Design a protein around this ligand. Structure first.
Ligand SMILES: CN(Cc1cnc2nc(N)nc(N)c2n1)c1ccc(C(=O)N[C@@H](CCC(=O)O)C(=O)O)cc1
Ligand SMILES: CN(Cc1cnc2nc(N)nc(N)c2n1)c1ccc(C(=O)N[C@@H](CCC(=O)O)C(=O)O)cc1
Ligand SMILES: [Ca+2]
Ligand SMILES: [Cl-]
Ligand SMILES: [Cl-]
Lengths: 159, 159
């Protein structure tokens, strides 16, 4: 099955021109926890943002342009991205916007981190029909000595 | 010689307890470069925000309450903090607010990272009359895919 995992600010903002204005090691831990040992599909811009291949995961980059790193797998279509995954129970799509748009229709589960940050976004998570999804887990946390904003982890399954 | 190093948002706002809303790996690299191989003195809130002893530095915590961890030095007064440093060319004071207020009078140098972020806060870096201080170095950088805001490194010497 295909799952999307994303971090959304208020109004579903997922990306800005520069790095997101937050420091959330607890949120990165949740991201690592839920992606470890699984193939991750990302767009070129997200790849460039990360800076390195994510350890212990099969990194697949969906881009029309040519591969620049021998450490990851470069694919040119959704179809191709899927095939590169092989026989695994769950494929994680980690963004950005266009990538999420292309995979949403095929997605059965969403892992969302809602952060209480009001920012002017460049890209946004595609509108999802709350009537189509069931929240099976939610957990709120305040900002603390290490995390700059309050956030809530949520997992939804398509009805 | 005593030096203070701090990261200031607009209006000289500095962290109090919760982590500051920015992601500036380039700024942390500057902090690391300037404090490695020297003793660092911090207050309890900063210690909690760091979450571990900074490697390659002698970590001293100035606090009235008992020290939990055996990996660092717990002191109860300025005098003791200083003594704990031994005889080194430069002691780095890394905050927070009360700590800065206590050492400023004795400081000979300021390493400041000014960040273009408007953050609402109670705490401010102590007032310094840059007329009693000579700006000796200043280098501005724009935000990028990895750093959330623009920042400017500045070093001042007490005249
Ligand atoms: C910019 N970016 C994209 C990013 C960030 N957080 C997200 N968070 C969620 N929930 N979903 C995403 N798709 C997501 N994507 C990044 C940047 C760094 C790391 C990262 O360093 N991850 C390490 C964990 C952090 C660490 O070791 O410092 C990992 O092993 O996953 C991950 C994603
Ligand atoms: C919360 N905090 C206090 C902090 C942060 N930036 C500052 N920046 C400046 N200029 N001045 C300070 N006093 C300052 N203090 C921190 C938190 C983490 C690390 C830290 O991880 N430092 C690693 C570098 C980054 C890394 O390895 O992840 C180091 O070796 O210094 C430092 C300071
Ligand atoms: Ca439910
Ligand atoms: Cl992307
Ligand atoms: Cl402190």
């Amino acid at each position: 099955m295909i799952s999307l995992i994303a971090a959304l600010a208020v109004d579903r903002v997922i990306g800005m021109e520069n790095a997101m204005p937050w420091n959330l090691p607890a949120c990165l831990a949740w991201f690592k926890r839920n992606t470890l040992d699984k193939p991750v599909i990302m767009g070129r811009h997200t790849w460039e943002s990360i800076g390195r291949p994510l350890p212990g995961r099969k990194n697949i980059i969906l881009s029309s342009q040519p591969g620049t790193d021998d450490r990851v797998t470069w694919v040119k279509s959704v179809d191709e991205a899927i095939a590169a995954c092989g026989d695994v129970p769950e494929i994680m799509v980690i963004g950005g916007g266009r990538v999420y748009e292309q995979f949403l229709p095929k997605a059965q589960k969403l892992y969302l981190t809602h952060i209480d940050a009001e920012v002017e976004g460049d890209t946004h998570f595609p509108d999802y029909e709350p009537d189509d999804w069931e929240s099976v887990f939610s957990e709120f946390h305040d900002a603390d000595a290490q995390n700059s904003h309050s956030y809530c982890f949520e997992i939804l399954e398509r009805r």
